[PDB]
Amino acid sequence: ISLTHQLRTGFHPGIAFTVVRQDRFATEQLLYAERASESYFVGQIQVHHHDAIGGVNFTLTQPRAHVDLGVGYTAVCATAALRCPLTDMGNTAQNLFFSRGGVPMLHDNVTESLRRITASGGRLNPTEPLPIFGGLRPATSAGIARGQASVCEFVAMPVSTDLQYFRTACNPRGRASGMLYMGDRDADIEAIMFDHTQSDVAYTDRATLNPWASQKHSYGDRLYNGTYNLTGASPIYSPCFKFFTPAEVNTNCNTLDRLLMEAKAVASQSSTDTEYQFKRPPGSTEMTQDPCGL
Amino acid sequence: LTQLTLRDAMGTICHSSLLDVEATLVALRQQHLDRQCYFGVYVAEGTED
Amino acid sequence: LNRVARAALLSDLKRRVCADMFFMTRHAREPRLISAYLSDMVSCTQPSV
Amino acid sequence: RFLELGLSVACICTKFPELAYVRDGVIQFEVQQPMIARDGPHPVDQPVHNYMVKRIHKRSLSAAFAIASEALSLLSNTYVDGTEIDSSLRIRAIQQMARNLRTVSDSFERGTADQLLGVLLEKAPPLSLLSPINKFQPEG
Amino acid sequence: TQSDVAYTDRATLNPWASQKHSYGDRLYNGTYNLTGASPIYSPCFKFFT
Amino acid sequence: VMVSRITHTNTRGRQVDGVLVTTATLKRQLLQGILQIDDTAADVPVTYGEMVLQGTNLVTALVMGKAVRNARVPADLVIVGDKLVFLEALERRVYQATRVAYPLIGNID
Amino acid sequence: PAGIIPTGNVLSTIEVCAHRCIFDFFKQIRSDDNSLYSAQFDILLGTYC
Amino acid sequence: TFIMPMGVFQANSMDRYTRHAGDFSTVSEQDPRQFPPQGIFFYNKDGIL
C-alpha cells in the first residue's frame, strides 16, 4: 500500500512504468507471375438430397482437387506503402483478477481498499462483493471512437552502459540472437536456449540485457508461462505467447526449404474484434499475419 | 502531440504471483548447490557467559 | 464492418476533412499531379444505365 | 468474360471433371543433376538426382439464393386446369428466372478466382528476401 | 453509469461540470429557454444536445 | 523447361507468362510521368477442352484401380526490363453492393 | 465385387455360408448394398522433363 | 586492418583548445573534458559504436 504510494501522488517512486503500441495495420496485395503450370479444370454438378422449414434445394455440385508437384515452387513481389493512412492511440493498464485458483483468508477489507482503493487513471473501474468460479459475462461499457484499450504489455530493461544498444540496434527480452534452427544439431536449447558457455549472440561488449532475468522459471515473466492454469482461467495471449515458449523440432527441419517451411498459424494472438482484448470463446478461425514470430 | 506524466500503476502490482514459493524453485529441485556455504546463517540464545 | 473497421475508416473521414483540398489555391509553387486532387475521382466512384 | 481478358493462361489443360472416382494423386517430377567437379583438389561430388513424396489441401462448398413455395404451389397443373386468364402470371413467369440462373448459376463463375489466391494468396509470404535468392547461394 | 465518452482516460482537463442542466444545459439547449426575449441569431441553440 | 506449339506475345510471333491481384489508385501511378502505352494487336485464341475414351484402357480403369496418364482484344501490354508487361487489372468485372467478408488487407501486429 | 466378365461357371449350389472357415474373405449381402458402388481410383498426371 | 589509438592524451597545451566558449562544457563545477580519455568508440560491422 506505500509502493504504489510512490505510485500515486508526488514522489515519482522507487519504481516506474511504460508503454508499447497496439493498433490495426490492414494489408492489401500485388505480385509478379510467369507461364502455364497452375492447371485449371472445368466440369459439372453432383448430389445428395433433403427437405426443410418451407424449403428444398440446389446447394449440390461440381467438386475439385489439385496438385503439388514442386521441386521448388513459384512467386516473388516488391511493394507499395499502406493506402491513405490508418493509425490511432492512447493510455493506461492490464488485467490480473478476473479468474481464479487461489487460497484463503486472514486479512481482506482493506485491500478491499485496493480495487474499492486500486483500479486507477482511465475509463471504468470495478466491483465490490466477490462470488466465485465462472466465465463471467457482465455489465455495460462503450462503443467505438478511438482506442480499444490500445494498451501496453510491460517488459523492462534494467540498466546501464555508454552510447550504442537503446542509441543503435535493439528489442525486448534479449539479444540479437538465434537459437540455431538447423545446423550443428537440435537437442541443445538448455546452453544455446538455457545454461551457459561463451560471449554474446549479439552485443558482446557486456553479458545480457537487464541485471535480473535471463533463464528458466522466473518472475516478471512469472507474469507469463502456461501449462498449469493461465491458459486455463483468464485467457490470454499474454503479453507474449511466443516471446519465452515452446517452438519447434519434430517434422521437417532442414535449413533451406523450410526456410520456406516455418513462421505460421497456430491458435493465436490479436485480431479485429472490438473493445479491450479477450481470449477464447468459440467462433472465429480467421488467419491474420504476424510478421514478428521467432 | 500528447502527455503521459504522473498517474497509474495501481490497479496493478499489489499483485499475487510474486511472493512465489512453491513451484518455480520446485521445477529446479535436485542438484547440489554451487560453491557456497554459510558465510554465517545459523542463530542462538545467550551464551551462559 | 461491425465494431473494429466502422469506427476508424470514417476516422478516415475527418483527415481528408483536415489537410488537403485547397490543393491549387495557395502558393505559386507546387503543381502538376493530376494524381489524387485532378486524376483519382471521375472513374472510381460510379454511374447508371 | 474469361477468353479475351485476362484472368488465365498460367495453368495446364489436363483432365477430370467429374473428379474423384479419382481417389488419388501424389504427382511429381525429378531433376537430374549432372557431374560437377571443380578445378582444383576438392572433394567428392556426384551425378545426383531428386525425386519426390507428398501432402496437399482443400476447403468445403456451395453458392447462394433461397425463397418460398412456388414449386408445387402451382406445379399442380401441367396441361388441363387453368384455361383462361393467367396472362400476366406467365408473362411475369418468363423474364424473372433468366437473370438469377444466367446470374444465379454463374456464382462459381463467381467462385474460380478466390480459391486459387487463398492457397496462391495462402501458400506464399514476403519479399526483400527473395532478392538475394539470387545474390547468396549457388555452390556452398 | 461508469466513465465517459469522448477522449479516453480523463473526465476532465479543467474541472468543473458534466451531466444535465444548471448553467449547464440552456446556455446552449432546448427544453426551458432563457436566451431571452425576442429574435435570436447569434446562434447556438442547436449547439448543445 | 518450355514446350508447346506456339504463339503468346505482343504482335509478330512467340511465348509467355502468369497471374495477378490488388485494387485501384496504383494504375493510376505509373500514368502521370515515367512509363507508358506499349503494344497493339492480338490474334489470341477462344476456348477450353474436351475428351474421348471407352474400351480397354480404362479396362485398366473400371475393375482394378489406380490411375496413370484467336479472338482479338486489348487486354494489353506494358513493359518491365526489355520485355513487355501488361496493366489493366481487376477492378472492372465482379460483385457490387451487399453484406459479408473475407481475407485480404486488414490489420496486423 | 469385380465387374470383370466371369471366367467360368461354378457347378455347385450349396450353402457356402456353412463353410466360412475356408477362403480368405467372406461377405454376404442379402439383396443388394451400396458397397457395390464405389469407383475410387488413383491418379497420375504425366511426364515432366 | 583497422587501427585506433585509445589512451592518447594531447600533451601540448595549445592543442587542448575548444572551438567556442564552451565547445564541450557542463553544468558541474569541474568540466571533465580535461580528464584524460580512457576508451575508444567505433562503429561496428553494423553501424554500432
From Swiss-Prot, chain H:
Subcellular location: Virion; Host nucleus
Family stated for the protein in its record: Belongs to the herpesviridae major capsid protein family.
Physiological role: Self-assembles to form an icosahedral capsid with a T=16 symmetry, about 200 nm in diameter, and consisting of 150 hexons and 12 pentons (total of 162 capsomers). Hexons form the edges and faces of the capsid and are each composed of six MCP molecules. In contrast, one penton is found at each of the 12 vertices. Eleven of the pentons are MCP pentamers, while the last vertex is occupied by the portal complex.
The protein's assembly and partners: Homomultimer. Makes the hexons and eleven out of twelve pentons. Interacts with triplex proteins 1/TRX1 and 2/TRX2; adjacent capsomers are linked together in groups of three by triplexes, heterotrimeric complexes composed of one molecule of TRX1 and two molecules of TRX2. Interacts with scaffold protein; this interaction allows efficient MCP transport to the host nucleus. Interacts with capsid vertex component 2/CVC2. Interacts with the small capsomere-interacting protein/SCP.
Name of the protein: Major capsid protein
Section covered of the full-length record: 418 to 466 of 1396
